[PDB]
Write a protein that binds this DNA or RNA. Structure first.
Ligand code: ZN
Length: 253
DNA sequence: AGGTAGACCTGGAC
DNA sequence: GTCCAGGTCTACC
């Protein structure tokens, strides 16, 4: 899921698990557990901790327990559900946290691409994968100044810049293409070639793009061959930053 | 060795 | 048997 849907999961999951105490952890695909590397230590350390909170950083969910934080990335098709220990697990269930009240937090993932890392709370932010993660796009910490500073410094295309997780959190292929379209900037342009006016406009559209989605219709992403919604020009697709890239050659410059 | 490009977690679909 | 999905932390220099 994208950032806005991860925020929805964060908001919806929290009341279903807050205040519950872990009694067991069952792991059916150890490779999902990335820290501690030994999934046995992962399972053992969580036992007896109570869920106190659930936060989001970029696309990462951060489950706050007593001593530890569990940092979870759903990647492609990871999903969490809360259900009774008495019911059969659903297909592709790879990790299960059993609570003392007979309920369970289940993690399902067809591709097995998701990741889990557990650290002491006070360490989580300075260890992978959260270490280096850029500012939240909806936060004052993500500013035109910050964006301009990174743009003027690189030889990369603007798209490559915006896909860099250290620049800003939670921007992937879709929102990058959409933001660039709304700002009227071609994705293949050198980041350093953007005028201050363009940086300001891109910042504004980046914020509106994720902002409208987190609170609540694509212009270019996956619409190649179809008419642009603003000028009717056919949307085109190329490779930029080694990625499938969608844009309107008339609206964007 | 800082900045960058892009390698890699797998099952499902071709 | 081959290829795709893809964000991001690795690894290349
Ligand atoms: Zn257009």
């Amino acid at each position: 899921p994208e950032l806005p849907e991860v925020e929805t999961i964060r908001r919806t999951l929290l009341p279903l698990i807050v205040g519950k105490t872990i009694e067991d952890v069952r792991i059916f695909w150890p490779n999902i557990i990335r820290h501690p590397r030994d999934s046995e230590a992962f399972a053992a350390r969580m036992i007896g901790q109570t869920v106190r909170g659930l936060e989001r950083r970029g696309k990462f969910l951060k489950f706050l327990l007593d001593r530890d934080a569990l940092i979870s990335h759903l990647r492609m098709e990871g999903r969490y559900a809360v259900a009774s220990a008495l019911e059969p697990l659903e297909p592709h269930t790879h990790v299960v946290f059993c609570f003392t009240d007979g309920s369970e937090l289940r993690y399902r993932d067809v591709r097995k691409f998701g990741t889990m890392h557990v650290y002491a709370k006070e360490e989580a932010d300075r260890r992978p994968p959260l270490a280096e993660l850029g500012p939240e796009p909806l936060s004052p910490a993500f500013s035109p100044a910050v964006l301009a500073e990174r743009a003027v410094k690189t030889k990369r295309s603007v798209k490559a810049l915006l896909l860099d997780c250290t620049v800003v959190a939670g921007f992937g292929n879709i929102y990058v293409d959409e933001s660039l379209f709304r700002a009227g900037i071609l994705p293949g342009r050198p980041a350093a070639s953007l005028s201050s006016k363009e940086i300001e406009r891109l910042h504004e559209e980046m914020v509106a793009t994720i902002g409208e989605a987190v609170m609540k219709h694509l212009y270019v992403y996956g619409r190649q061959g179809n008419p642009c919604k603003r000028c009717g020009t056919p949307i085109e697709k190329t490779v930029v930053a080694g990625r499938g890239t969608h844009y309107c050659p008339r609206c964007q410059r």
